């Protein structure tokens, strides 16, 4: 049959936080991240955010 996996996400551009539970994306990278660090910090409960590999709209089971 014929492929439908090809692209959609590619690596980073889609962290969350692991406190308020909140979430960013790349254009929020270059704004939350921290040199005293070295990573990207929430903005409302600065807590140390992360990569989230479910934070995109897949097939969600059709
Ligand atoms: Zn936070």
Redesign the pocket.
Known sequence: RIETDERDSTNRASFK?P??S?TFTDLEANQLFDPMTGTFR??????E?EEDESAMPKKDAR
């Open positions: 936080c406190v308020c909140s929430c903005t409302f409960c600065h807590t955010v």
